[PDB]
Design a protein around this ligand. Structure first.
Ligand SMILES: Cc1cc2nc3c(=O)[nH]c(=O)nc-3n(C[C@H](O)[C@H](O)[C@H](O)COP(=O)(O)O)c2cc1C
Ligand SMILES: Cc1cc2nc3c(=O)[nH]c(=O)nc-3n(C[C@H](O)[C@H](O)[C@H](O)COP(=O)(O)O)c2cc1C
Lengths: 120, 122
């Protein structure tokens, strides 16, 4: 039961073009609120948080950004938040998708969400 | 400008869970009309035909299901039809997506539509 995301890798800043119903149900963000955004909003603790939360690991975020910049897959884990602010550990897999011309047209995201017992 | 498709590889018979705008524009089918269905409907001539049309290459259709069954990529070309029944040549690439526990959870479809000489028309 994993979250599934698609970004457009040609448009700047990997805008989301699809999220599955698991993403929606687990994160509390409905598709209409998310398509056209970069996924990094999940690192903010709910919609009033304008900044990445100090508990999401900036070393993992750096590594994601590098894997995307380099056109390679990523696998790791970082803290995300539901729309209502509850914390969620996200075991994230990114997979670049090739259209034809040896170019990356899309990136697929797989999210395996893990409940966390932390007090914020 | 490719069509882009996602299916659920865990649910039975690869129901479509996403198509992009290019798919909609080129095939003439809106997302609402195709979600939850297998893509094979594009091998039928228009929305009211239930079985794959004879001019569709059954050898290629066979190789597509083989690739899906084996969980490997597919690349190839086949005849499809728009919602208005006009023929399409679809250069299709399929890519399985591995979720957790080394399992395929989804398949991605890239459609590059190319011109055919195929013409059934009046
Ligand atoms: C397909 C895809 C899925 C992503 N899914 C998530 C996610 O579920 N949670 C998250 O925190 N970041 C996710 N990201 C990462 C952010 O979009 C962004 O790449 C990351 O924060 C690094 O960039 P930045 O330093 O500019 O924020 C995803 C990225 C892509 C391309
Ligand atoms: C992700 C994905 C995208 C597909 N896209 C198309 C398509 O655009 N056109 C088409 O004729 N078949 C497409 N198919 C194939 C059909 O769904 C079906 O797998 C094919 O006809 C072989 O299976 P069948 O003999 O049971 O019909 C796609 C399949 C998958 C998994």
């Amino acid at each position: 039961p994993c979250g599934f995301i698609v970004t457009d890798a040609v448009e700047p800043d990997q805008p989301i073009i699809y999220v599955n119903t698991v993403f929606e149900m687990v994160t509390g963000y409905r598709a209409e609120e998310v398509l056209g955004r970069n996924c990094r909003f999940l690192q903010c603790r709910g919609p009033f948080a304008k900044r990445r939360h100090p508990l999401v690991d900036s070393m993992v975020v750096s590594e994601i950004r590098k894997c995307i910049d380099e056109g390679i897959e990523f696998q790791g884990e970082l803290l995300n938040f539901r729309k209502d602010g509850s914390p969620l550990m996200n075991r994230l897999r990114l997979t670049p998708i090739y259209g034809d011309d040896d170019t990356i047209t899309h990136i697929i995201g797989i999210q395996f969400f893990i409940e966390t017992d932390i007090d914020l």
